[PDB]
Amino acid sequence: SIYQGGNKLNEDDFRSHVYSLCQLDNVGVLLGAGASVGCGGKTMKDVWKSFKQNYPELLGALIDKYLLVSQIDSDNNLVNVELLIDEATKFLSVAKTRRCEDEEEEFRKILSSLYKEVTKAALLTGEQFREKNQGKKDAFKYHKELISKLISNRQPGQSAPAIFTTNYDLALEWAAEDLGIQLFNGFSGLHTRQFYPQNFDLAFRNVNHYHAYLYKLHGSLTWYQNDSLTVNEVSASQAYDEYINDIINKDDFYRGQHLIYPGANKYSHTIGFVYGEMFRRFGEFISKPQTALFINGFGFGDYHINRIILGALLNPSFHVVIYYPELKEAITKVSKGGGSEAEKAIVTLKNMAFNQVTVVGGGSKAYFNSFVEHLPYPVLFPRDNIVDELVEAIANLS
Amino acid sequence: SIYQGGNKLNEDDFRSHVYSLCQLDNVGVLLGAGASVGCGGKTMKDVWKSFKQNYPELLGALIDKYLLVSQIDSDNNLVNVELLIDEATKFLSVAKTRRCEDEEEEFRKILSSLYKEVTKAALLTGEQFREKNQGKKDAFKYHKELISKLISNRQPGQSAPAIFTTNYDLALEWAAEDLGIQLFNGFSGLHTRQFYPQNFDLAFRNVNHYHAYLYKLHGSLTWYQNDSLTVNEVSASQAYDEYINDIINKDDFYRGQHLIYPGANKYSHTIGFVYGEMFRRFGEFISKPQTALFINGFGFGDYHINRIILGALLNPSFHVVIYYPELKEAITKVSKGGGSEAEKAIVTLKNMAFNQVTVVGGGSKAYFNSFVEHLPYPVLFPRDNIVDELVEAIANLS
Amino acid sequence: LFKLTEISAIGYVVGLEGERIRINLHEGLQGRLASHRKGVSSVTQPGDLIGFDAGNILVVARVTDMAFVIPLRQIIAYAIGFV
Amino acid sequence: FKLTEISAIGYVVGLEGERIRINLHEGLQGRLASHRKGVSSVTQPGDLIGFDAGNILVVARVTDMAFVEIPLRQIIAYAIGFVKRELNGYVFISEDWRLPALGSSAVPLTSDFLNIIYSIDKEELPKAVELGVDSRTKTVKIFASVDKLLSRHLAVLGSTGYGKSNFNALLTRKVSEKYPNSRIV
Numbered sequence A, B: 001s002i003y004q005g006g007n008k009l010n011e012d013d014f015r016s017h018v019y020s021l022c023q024l025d026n027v028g029v030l031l032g033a034g035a036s037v038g039c040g041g042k043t044m045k046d047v048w049k050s051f052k053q054n055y056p057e058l059l060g061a062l063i064d065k066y067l068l069v070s071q072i073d074s075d076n077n078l079v080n081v082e083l084l085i086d087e088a089t090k091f092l093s094v095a096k097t098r099r100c101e102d103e104e105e106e107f108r109k110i111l112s113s114l115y116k117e118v119t120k121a122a123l124l125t126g127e128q129f130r131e132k133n134q135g136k137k138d139a140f141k142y143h144k145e146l147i148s149k150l151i152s153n154r155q156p157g158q159s160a161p162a163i164f165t166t167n168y169d170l171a172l173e174w175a176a177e178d179l180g181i182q183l184f185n186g187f188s189g190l191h192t193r194q195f196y197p198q199n200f201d202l203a204f205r206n207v208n209h210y211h212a213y214l215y216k217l218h219g220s221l222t223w224y225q226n227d228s229l230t231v232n233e234v235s236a237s238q239a240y241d242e243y244i245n246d247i248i249n250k251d252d253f254y255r256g257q258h259l260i261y262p263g264a265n266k267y268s269h270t271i272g273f274v275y276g277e278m279f280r281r282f283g284e285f286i287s288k289p290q291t292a293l294f295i296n297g298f299g300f301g302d303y304h305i306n307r308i309i310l311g312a313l314l315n316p317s318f319h320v321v322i323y324y325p326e327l328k329e330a331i332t333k334v335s336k337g338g339g340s341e342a343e344k345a346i347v348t349l350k351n352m353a354f355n356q357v358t359v360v361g362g363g364s365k366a367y368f369n370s371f372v373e374h375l376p377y378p379v380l381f382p383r384d385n386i387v388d389e390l391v392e393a394i395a396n397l398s
Numbered sequence C: 001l002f003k004l005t006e007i008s009a010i011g012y013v014v015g016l017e018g019e020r021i022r023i024n025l026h027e028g029l030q031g032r033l034a035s036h037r038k039g040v041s042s043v044t045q046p047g048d049l050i051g052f053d054a055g056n057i058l059v060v061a062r063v064t065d066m067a068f069v070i071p072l073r074q075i076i077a078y079a080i081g082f083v
Numbered sequence D: 001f002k003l004t005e006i007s008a009i010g011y012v013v014g015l016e017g018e019r020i021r022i023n024l025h026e027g028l029q030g031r032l033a034s035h036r037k038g039v040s041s042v043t044q045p046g047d048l049i050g051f052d053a054g055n056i057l058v059v060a061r062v063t064d065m066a067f068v069e070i071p072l073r074q075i076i077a078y079a080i081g082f083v084k085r086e087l088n089g090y091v092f093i094s095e096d097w098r099l100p101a102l103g104s105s106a107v108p109l110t111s112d113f114l115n116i117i118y119s120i121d122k123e124e125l126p127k128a129v130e131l132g133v134d135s136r137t138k139t140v141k142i143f144a145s146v147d148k149l150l151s152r153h154l155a156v157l158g159s160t161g162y163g164k165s166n167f168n169a170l171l172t173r174k175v176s177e178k179y180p181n182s183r184i185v
Ligand SMILES: Nc1ncnc2c1ncn2[C@@H]1O[C@H](COP(=O)(O)OP(=O)(O)OC[C@H]2O[C@H](O)[C@H](O)[C@@H]2O)[C@@H](O)[C@H]1O
Pocket: A032, A033, A034, A035, A037, A038, A043, A044, A045, A080, A081, A082, A166, A296, A297, A298, A299, A300, A301, A302, A324, A325, A326, A366, A367, A368, A369
């Protein structure tokens, strides 16, 4: 269940390939929504499989009246939830413009009910979302090891790792504030925090292994636009108090040009400028010599990311590694006239005369918590907890 | 006996650990009151006993009327005196200000009685305090070896040694004047001394010169304030006349806001400036890389030193050595859920798995004289007095 | 508060000529002595063992020479094995 | 206040295997020295010098001399042991794997350390016998123990006219003068 170059491999000859890959000039990682189900998250099926259940009286307008979703997809639970929100956001602006008072209050309900199932699921904890020191817990234990291993496996002079993701949750920031690591994300300031797209070109140094880079392709819960025209970041406690305790526990959606998740308001020239600058950097990191990319958690149901990856194998120095835990069923289904675009796409490159590609399956053998353990610790790295027995002796001195 | 890492240790490996610790970048010693018992001093229990044996009629007000002392601690002789004197200075300062003519007199004859008893113990020679060459005698013979061995075991280019202490006697200066070594203590001048806190950063060099640093944390018997803005230092013959004689002999004699021993008048803003710049420097010294500390005479009853020591132990390059004569008689009290905070603190250290800690507790084997014999002389050091046999003929010539 | 190791270094490699290894030391006693959670360790003279990081392995070597070029100091060593 | 009463003549500048390389100071500091016991020098490839190391003292023998190309002079040496304290004296141990550190200072040897390098134990001192004096310096007397020397067999070798019959009479008479209940044939 490990296919390189079209044919098979074994565990050791692949665990020895991983180690040689992590030692290249440029190293990166792409994550998805299936990586945060071991911490309190939910995939994209379970969201529609619950919207359907809780709001049936709205599921008829979308199909019989406005034609925004199809019946077989809704029954097989195969809908894209970002494009639906974008289209429903664009249907409301026209009505607000040309003064139609029915089609304006018919969409507020739809949008309020859609922005209420994805938020409740992106809170990995619950009412402890507003509190402090949340990366100290047990669910965020492998996220730490990922960063530790990605940083400690570099040499002096070699660049720093990169991280891309599609989630809009706070699981890698909580887990880095604890280690003592600093992540660049484009924003600067504390009392008025703003987006400057050149802070990705900076780095630290001492004057007497500190930092990394993070790219969020679909936004976050802490990003918003005010009565001004500028994007602002804030903390979780402040967001809970402004615009997150009303979404759930009320029925309010009148700020229709205000939120920046999950990829909704891309018709404004000020909010699309922040989405573009992330794909423009993905497609520029993925085009360098001596590059390696690990993928995990991602279902290949996006046309542009595939059209961007496929076009990078034309350079002989780019290598890929993929984890897909439902590979058997896909081969079966596309053996005899069937399957969806994702399965066809992955099977297309599973059969190739390309040693640059490597696919991994096996259900629980392709999950996040196994991806991590396949990565090496150095031999001179501190692991034994030899400082914790001593921080409570200072507390006993009450 | 000797425990390192929770495991027992033997003498010839201890004597080689000591010689490897005495060769690091930073080396220091912290002394206490027991270290001046062979020279003519005493501890705090012997002071409290004499107080309660000679002034039994003031031992009732302090307990039943103002609540400065407790009966259980008075009975078991566990009182802190340098902490009872500051409160009694505060009471008198408040009474003077609010014009209570009756309560101003009682706190004026409590302090005289306290100062007489705490001052008689720190002369070490009696009426020969106001004389010259008092370090030629025999009681100051082990204080010279300490300094000689701390200086001789350095190399060219290395820093110089540091000696912190809580005493306020004059036993480490008499011994260096009879040995030809310059101590830095933060004072300058002859006809008018005063505190400059930035000459702890100076040193000597030759052209065609051996020194050390001394930090007193509770004051000295020769420091005093007369004007509004400056503390002054003075010699022993000049102090005996002015103020140290009337204290002993006369019956009621007290000047307020005048003396700088022991930790008494910290409510001003010129005296606390002297007490703070010593703890700041202690902290700074105990936080550098490649640091070694020896402790002797200190009973571990100071919460503000306990945690400095505990928290300087998070750094891998800090080693400490402790001497405690009463370890056995205290390991039991806390197995039986008893004991005082000092006993608990020291057993917490004795029972941890750290190799940066070492405890020596064999009674008269954990005393000042044995400490000084555990340290090494070099082979080429000139160790005999060839010259005194030649200094007698020059006298005889007459 | 993130640290990549707990035992500190002694120098850096600047040359390989066949079997030989060439090392340049840091300035001060930081190039001779060390101190860690377990004790005190030194490297002083020919006939002593030294180690190098290589990621997943630690290379072991024996010293042969030492000399001057304050002035700068060098070392020569040969390889023994790895852990 | 003094750390030493014996001055230096050079410093170590190299360690190449079992060898030691030493650069000297300019002038008669490099050849002579005066101290409370007399005058000592280091002047040709047969002499002994020592190196200070704090706890021990390394002892070495000279082998070469030269100008590198006022000019600068070098020296080369080998090691034969070290000295240390026992209770209130010193003791000499012979083992050759130790070496001094870079920058350490070189110092000459005196008649107080030579008399420890060429001496016998304390256990054997009341059973000793005098034979002569050291040749190069002539400040140190040589003793040997009757037990070690005679409990086993002994050999005396030499050509004609060089002093071989004085030795046997010296020895046999000094054994009697000290142990008058002996037996000699
Ligand atoms: N514990 C686990 N560990 C690892 N992988 C898992 C786990 N559980 C499930 N999976 C895998 O995780 C996958 C879940 O796939 P989905 O969440 O639908 O897709 P997305 O996260 O890319 O959705 C975001 C996209 O939506 C828009 O279309 C945009 O294009 C975005 O790209 C499955 O293949 C599971 O096998």
